[PDB]
């Protein structure tokens, strides 16, 4: 945009400032070496040369002072423009006083090459402006060098130096754009990944206690990290002794929830269970869960607590106080009965959808029954509590009305696209160098020497084959046969890339050396011309930035200067001194320049790799926390809860089933290591039921939770839209098919069980129900209603291995062609006698 790409040069400023400091130093060093040249070697008869050199050296140290000002940080383009106009004018004015027969073309042209490079690469001017300054400098330098073949040869040399100039320019700034963009990506992903890690933490703590969550956040087992992405499924249980289990049940929940609009009910129930959570976090009792009108805690199951009994009955008396305050405050006639039992408990996680930390033992079943045998307002404790309670409470005899039991009441830029572009430019300057070297023949109409045209054709065909390889690699024609190209693409690794890059860099200097076998040191136009062209070819060795620095720079020194140390002696008198000076300054320039550009390329690859690592890491954390969020609540509640604060809804028709494994108690036996192996078997069965949920034809069936051995699931909730290709009561049909198929799953499970059989009964009912969410910073999706309680009645009054159906669910299921038989007539609390039906015949 605009403030994007301005902040780009805000964070690409200091490397531009460092480059500009190096260009200032290099121009000053050029003025220094030409000063000692024209002060010792030649032109010691006139001081017109050396005093502009010394004054421009001190102008450059003036600019090196001016860099440090604070009125530079937005003025750097205009400061660079002033510097490059001074250097343009100085090079033209130090060229201007020649052609008296004293100074060559090979020195002034090196100044031309140097100043065009410092314009293109380091001055950091815009493209149009630096291009028109470059072309204007080149044409003014050729029209002030003049004061039908050689002139157009020099114009060809300026053509290829502007080619390599614009190429280095555009690739340096597309890399400086793209590295900025990748570091912008990698700094967005750090903050956004911190956000997703906070959400994942909040969803872990809402389903597991603190000790085991903080275990899970240092990733103690890596296999869970691999699995959230062979014989038994993994499961975590710890048979822990000496806990103290509390249940609690709201008395009179039905009349308290009598005519609420299913938003008042969730609100008051939120208030009540929030008061209970405050009690839990005071009393240091872990709550476990909340089901229906029932709440239940433990007392130090992950942590060995010494006053666990005390913590449990103190939490029960706290509950009695909190519900009498709620009764006074909100004016609702309720109280609650509490049962407290101690003992040993194996506590962990079973299932894999909707899983949650629970407890299982027989001590838990005892605590459930002593809640069921409790009287309202009073906490109903056992001998197992009271044997170390120390009896500092208002104890009673807890006697039944019908076992030592008591009551208590109180107290661009693609990395293989740049290779295409620089192979293109290397072969086009090899082309026009060959053209310039051929058209030197204005004396012969046909070219004399054989080896020149031989090397010309040889490297010409080599460049055109490497061009076709690269251009069909990118443009991807798939024309003849590519399996040789696929296996030839493989073998150009890092070091074969080095060697083909060596040749593809070198070969224009081979084309210009190809014209040295015929004698040249007789004429001086030929000598200075081949010197100018060979420095034009040595300065062309910048383009393969995907190579290394020292490799290209040392190959440049060799195959651009070594043959002229060879041809130093071939006698040509003081032009050797100025040409070794001129290749010195040019080689120092090209050493620094391709050093800095391959450093830029290395940093671009670094910023690509790190900013892809952070993208995969945030994709992992986002997928993980989204799996936990679709775990703990359904999807449409997550939609209506993202845009708001709490959730409640009243559905007018939805079915629900419970599903109880009847005979698990005669499989439990505790004689081995607590019987946790028996719960591994039960985990396998609940896992097979959860595998039924991943079917695409069981999409709109929700699993509420599992309760001990019982499995609860309900439908009709996600279907907000009355479909055109479907039925208004089809979710009951697919829920009944879900019940049939989990009957099938237990039949398939018993084949792997030897000389024992699990039997389950289910119960089915539909009607209007009441969805809701309880916690905040905890979460719990749950449904309530009368449909649910009649469904639990159809469960518990069931015959095993047979589906039991209520009356209205019979009336709507039997109009879809199913078969049933009249079971009998069952008392239902609230409905009285009720007409039930059974699915197997």
């Amino acid at each position: 945009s605009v403030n994007l790409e301005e902040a780009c040069m805000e964070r690409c400023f200091p490397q531009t400032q460092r480059r500009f400091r190096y260009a200032l130093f290099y121009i000053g060093f050029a003025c220094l070496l030409w000063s000692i040249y024209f002060g010792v070697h030649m032109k010691s008869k006139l001081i017109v040369m050396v005093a502009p050199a010394l004054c421009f050296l001190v102008v450059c140290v003036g600019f090196f002072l001016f860099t440090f000002t604070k009125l530079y940080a937005r003025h750097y383009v205009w400061t660079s423009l002033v510097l490059t106009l001074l250097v343009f004018a100085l090079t033209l004015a130090a060229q201007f006083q020649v052609l008296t027969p004293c100074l060559s073309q090979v020195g002034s042209f090196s100044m031309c090459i140097e100043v065009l490079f410092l314009l293109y690469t380091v001055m950091h001017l815009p493209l149009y402006l630096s291009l028109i300054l470059g072309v204007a400098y080149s044409v003014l330098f050729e029209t002030f060098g003049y004061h039908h073949w050689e002139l157009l040869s020099r114009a060809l040399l300026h053509l290829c130096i502007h080619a390599i100039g614009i190429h280095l320019f555009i690739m340096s700034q597309v890399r400086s754009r793209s590295t900025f963009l990748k570091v912008g990506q990698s700094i967005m992903h750090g903050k956004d990944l911190e956000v997703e890690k906070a959400l994942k933490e909040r969803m872990i703590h809402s389903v597991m206690p603190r000790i085991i969550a903080d275990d899970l956040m240092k990733q103690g087992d890596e296999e869970s990290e691999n699995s959230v992405k062979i014989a038994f499924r993994p499961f975590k249980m710890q048979q822990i002794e000496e806990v103290s289990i509390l249940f609690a049940d709201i008395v009179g929940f039905t009349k308290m929830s009598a005519n609420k609009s299913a938003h008042a009910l969730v609100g008051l129930l939120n208030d009540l269970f929030g008061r209970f959570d405050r009690l839990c976090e005071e009393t240091k009792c872990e709550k476990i869960s909340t089901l229906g009108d029932c709440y239940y805690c433990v007392a130090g199951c992950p942590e060995p607590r010494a006053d666990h009994a005390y913590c449990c009955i103190e939490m029960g008396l706290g509950m009695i106080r909190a519900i009498e305050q709620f009764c006074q405050e909100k004016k609702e006639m309720v109280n609650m009965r509490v049962g407290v039992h101690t003992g040993t408990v194996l506590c962990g996680i079973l299932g894999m959808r909707r899983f949650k930390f629970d407890v299982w033992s027989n001590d838990v079943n005892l605590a459930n029954l002593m809640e069921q045998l409790g009287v309202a307002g009073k906490v109903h404790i056992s001998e197992a509590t009271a044997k170390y309670l120390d009896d500092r409470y208002e104890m009673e005899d807890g006697k039944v009305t019908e076992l030592k039991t008591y009551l208590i009441a109180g107290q661009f830029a693609s990395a293989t696209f740049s290779s295409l572009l620089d192979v293109l430019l290397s072969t086009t300057v090899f082309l026009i160098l060959s053209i310039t070297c051929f058209l030197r023949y204005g004396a012969a109409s046909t070219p004399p020497p054989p080896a020149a045209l031989a090397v010309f054709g040889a490297a010409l065909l080599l460049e055109i084959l490497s061009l076709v390889v690269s251009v069909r690699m990118v443009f991807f024609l798939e024309d003849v046969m590519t399996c040789t190209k696929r296996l030839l693409e493989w073998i150009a690794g890092w070091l074969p890339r080095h060697f083909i890059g060596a040749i593809l860099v070198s070969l224009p200097a081979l084309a210009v050396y190809s014209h040295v076998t015929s004698e040249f040191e007789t004429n001086i136009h030929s000598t200075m011309f081949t010197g100018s062209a060979v420095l034009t070819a040595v300065v062309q060795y910048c383009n393969f930035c995907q190579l290394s620095s020292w490799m290209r720079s040392s190959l440049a020194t060799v195959v651009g200067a070594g043959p002229l140390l060879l041809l130093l002696y071939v006698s040509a008198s003081l032009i050797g001194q100025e040409v070794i000076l001129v290749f010195f300054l040019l080689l120092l320039l090209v050493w620094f320049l391709n050093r800095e550009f391959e450093v830029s390329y290395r940093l671009h690859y670094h910023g690509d790799v790190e900013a892809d690592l952070h993208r995969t890491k945030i994709q992992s954390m986002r997928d993980q926390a989204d799996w936990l969020l679709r775990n703990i609540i359904p999807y449409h509640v997550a939609e209506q809860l993202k845009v708001s604060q709490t959730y409640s809804k009243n559905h007018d028709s939805g079915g629900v089933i419970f599903a109880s494994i009847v005979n698990f108690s005669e499989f439990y036996e505790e004689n081995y290591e607590g019987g946790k192996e028996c719960y591994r078997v039960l985990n396998e069965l609940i896992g097979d039921f959860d595998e039924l949920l991943s079917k695409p034809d069981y999409s709109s069936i929700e699993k509420i939770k599992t309760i001990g051995a019982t499995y609860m699931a309900a439908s009709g909730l996600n279907a907000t839209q009355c479909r055109d290709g479907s039925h208004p009561q089809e979710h009951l049909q697919i829920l009944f098919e879900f019940a049939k198929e989990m009957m099938r799953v237990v039949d398939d499970f018993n084949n792997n069980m030897l000389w024992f059989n699990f039997k389950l009964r289910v119960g089915f009912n539909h009607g209007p129900l009441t969805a809701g969410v309880i916690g905040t910073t905890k979460l719990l999706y749950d449904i309530w209603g009368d449909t649910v309680n009649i469904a639990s009645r159809m469960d518990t009054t069931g015959v095993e291995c047979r589906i039991q159906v209520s009356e209205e669910s019979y009336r709507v299921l039997s109009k879809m062609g199913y078969e049933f038989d009249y079971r009998g007539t069952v008392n239902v609390k609230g409905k009285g006698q009720m007409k039930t039906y059974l699915y197997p015949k």
Partner: protein, 341 residues
């Protein structure tokens, strides 16, 4: 942290679950291992095994369908004394009972009823212990090691035994194998190294105690088919012992019972070419035992998919040397089996 070392020594052990049907000899193999690689009620339940055997024979006299009667009919008062004490909670074993048991075991209608012991349920240490209680009529004799191996005590519930051979840890799970105990096996199926399936080979002619209408070896075959194809054992190899070789040998050499009377594919069975019998062996016994081995290897062949193997050995659990040899071989085998993970 201290759980990494304990976790890796838990990796280091070998879990040798012993399966097998009723009275196939699992607990005898565990007793043999603790003789190899490691105090008064043993005398009492030796005497219980005695009394159980002698009252079973005395009842089974009249309880054969042709009633084998007394060859010496003077011991009818003794027979009535043995039937008198048949169902009693405790018994102090007076010397009267020792003289009654000895006088019964010398009678030949008694022994003629004993020879038809495939028609009723009788324990597999009667012949040894009638003679040995005739030696230990008294109470001041400590029973020998073979006496400890022969005492039949029923197993109910998962037992364990940790022993260590040459700095390798073995942890094996003796289990009961009656039809009521089989629901308890699946507790032991987590991360078990190997399964040493144990088959009473000589009980081809007997029936199980549960329903009295199913062949013991057919029961063991169906049990092997069940545990081989089990969905939690489909990557776990099964060493297969075949116990009671000597009883099999003498029941074949007695020639009264034929295997083709009960398994009618035996009559057209030929001994295999790779059969490597022991020295001094009637090869019809070899044909018998390789028939039973290949009966199990059919089950281990018809599935498996290269996931888990089966390594049948021949063994007699009341002889310690045989157990030494086959457990050295199995030691190498389960070394290879634990190195499969």
């Amino acid at each position: 942290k201290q759980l990494q070392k304990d976790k890796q020594v838990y990796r280091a052990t070998h879990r040798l679950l012993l399966l097998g049907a009723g009275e196939s000899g699992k607990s005898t193999i565990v007793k043999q291992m603790r003789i190899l690689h490691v105090k008064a009620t043993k005398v009492q339940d030796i005497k219980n095994n005695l009394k159980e055997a002698i009252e079973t024979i005395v009842a089974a006299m009249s309880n054969l369908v042709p009633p084998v009667e007394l060859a010496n009919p003077e011991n009818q008062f003794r027979v009535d004394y043995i039937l008198s004490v048949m169902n009693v909670p405790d018994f102090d074993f007076p010397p009267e009972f020792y003289e009654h048991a000895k006088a019964l075991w010398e009678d030949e209608g008694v022994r003629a009823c004993y020879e038809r012991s495939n028609e009723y349920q009788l324990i597999d240490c009667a012949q040894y212990f009638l003679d040995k209680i005739d030696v230990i009529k008294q109470d001041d004799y400590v029973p020998s090691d073979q006496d400890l191996l022969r005492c039949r005590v029923l197993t109910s519930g998962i037992f364990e035994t940790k022993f260590q051979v040459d700095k390798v840890n073995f942890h094996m799970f003796d289990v009961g194998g009656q039809r009521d105990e089989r629901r308890k096996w699946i507790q032991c199926f987590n991360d078990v190294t190997a399964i040493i399936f144990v088959v009473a080979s000589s009980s081809y002619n007997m029936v199980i105690r549960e329903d009295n209408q199913t062949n013991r070896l057919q029961e063991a075959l169906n049990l092997f088919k069940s545990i081989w194809n089990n969905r939690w054992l489909r990557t776990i190899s099964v060493i297969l012992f075949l116990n009671k070789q000597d009883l099999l040998a003498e029941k074949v050499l007695a020639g009264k019972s034929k295997i083709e009377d009960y398994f009618p594919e035996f009559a057209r069975y030929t001994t295999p070419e790779d059969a490597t019998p022991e020295p001094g062996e009637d090869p019809r016994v070899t044909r018998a035992k390789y028939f039973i081995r290949d009966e199990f290897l059919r089950i281990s062949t018809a599935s498996g998919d290269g996931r888990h193997y089966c390594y049948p050995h021949f063994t007699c659990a009341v002889d310690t040397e045989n157990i030494r040899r086959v457990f050295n071989d199995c030691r190498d085998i389960i070394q290879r089996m634990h190195l499969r993970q």
